[PDB]
Amino acid sequence: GLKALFFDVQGTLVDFYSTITREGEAFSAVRGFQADWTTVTEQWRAEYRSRLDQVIKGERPWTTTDRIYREALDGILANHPWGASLNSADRDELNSLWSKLIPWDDTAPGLARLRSKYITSTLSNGSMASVLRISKLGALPFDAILTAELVRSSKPDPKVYQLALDSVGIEAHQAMMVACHKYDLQAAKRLGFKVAFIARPFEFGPNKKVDTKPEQYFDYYANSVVELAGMLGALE
Amino acid sequence: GLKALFFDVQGTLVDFYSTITREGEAFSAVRGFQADWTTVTEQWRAEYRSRLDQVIKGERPWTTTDRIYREALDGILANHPWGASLNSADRDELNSLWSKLIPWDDTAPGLARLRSKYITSTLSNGSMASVLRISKLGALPFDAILTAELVRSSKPDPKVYQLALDSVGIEAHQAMMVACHKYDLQAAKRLGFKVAFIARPFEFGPNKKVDTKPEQYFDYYANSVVELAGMLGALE
Ligand SMILES: [Ca+2]
């Protein structure tokens, strides 16, 4: 009997691409600048992923994801003419967008229906501070906020998923992992979780290949959190 | 400026005395025993607190709060003549009441007013699973659910208060600890937190004397979460 649902956040529930682009161009429209924010996002994510690789590879000490995004921003703005005009405080403002990630239109209605039938919680690699603020700013209801920062690691570390089971007080087969990333669902299913895949074809913006094809080990396959709620029988 | 409020749960927000005594009485009606549940309650908590102190002093391995309550229950049932007539399943049902504690009348309206103005989170010694279920069952809104289980300790360990600051991403002077127990606010105020004391004159039942006098280090003294919300300017 399913009892709790754990949701990945970035990409699965929120649209970080549209957030960085539209809030960046407004950030540059206030000071007077001109930059391709689509290429800014890829570089920021690349530096963010170039540096978190080092953390678990041992080439960088552990630090919250907000700090990694802030430091990655310093590395990418060195390759931009307007980057020097942004002081230490201007770059903190830019970095705070990761705590303001805009939700997909189906996220709030689907989460509310699921919470009325199950225990719901986050389980993502982001910082607790950012995920907390993303859910509060977006009025996304959860019964708890859990990130891998609570065990100083990141998915697919088995102890991140054990954190979910220990915190909610249930066994693996009573829990479901919801995500748009297949490495997440593979690791959770290995540990006995149920897994629900949410196809997010626009996660990385236009002209990007996204693997959304169904897999046999998926317990559920949906194109929205609202659709997943209907499959689980979580009505209005 | 205040940014986040952290709440103790047991006693501060929920009435465990009334939950145990009444639900224990209802539990006993269909099983054929009558007991004085005001003494069973304080025997349970005394047994729990003694086994908990063994975990703290290193004389017993760490387990969740629910497991200590469950073993304390086995302890007190051995001292009552009707204890043997309760099998393991009956005792798990009795022990589950620690996850169903009813809130005080003021808790739900006060938390919602405070959440519309601040980030709010729990920060108690209970288990994550029980505090999570207490808020879900009682419709107590929090932006986050934190307990000392997340650092495998107990207040007033400074690690528990640092967990609150790390998870929400603020500094001590921007956080307030809200509790009905003075030991909690003493440690938090020592660590830079603001502190709000909520007087719960009936935390331990009708005729047990309770320390509710004001203290000079309190930033706020209230008799309800509703009153604290008014003192902080958080109107409906
Ligand atoms: Ca919440």
Numbering used by the authors:
A (entry chain B), B (entry chain A): 41 to 276
Text lifted from the article:
After crystal screening and optimization, crystal structures of RhCESH[L] and KlCESH[L] were successfully resolved at 1.94 Å and 2.02 Å, respectively. RhCESH[L] and NoCESH[L] share identical sequences, whereas KlCESH[L] displays only 36% sequence identity with RhCESH[L]. The core domains of both RhCESH[L] and KlCESH[L] can be well superimposed (with an r.s.m.d value of 0.944 Å), while there are some notable differences in the cap domain. Furthermore, residues from the core domain surrounding the catalytic pocket in KlCESH[L] can be superimposed well with those in RhCESH[L], while some significant conformational differences are observed in the residues from the cap domain. Furthermore, similar hydrophilic and hydrophobic interactions at the dimer interface are also observed in KlCESH[L]. Careful analysis of the obtained CESH[L] structures revealed a potential active catalytic triad consisting of D18, H190, and E212, along with the active water molecule in RhCESH[L] while the corresponding possible catalytic triad in KlCESH[L] consists of D48, H221, and E243.
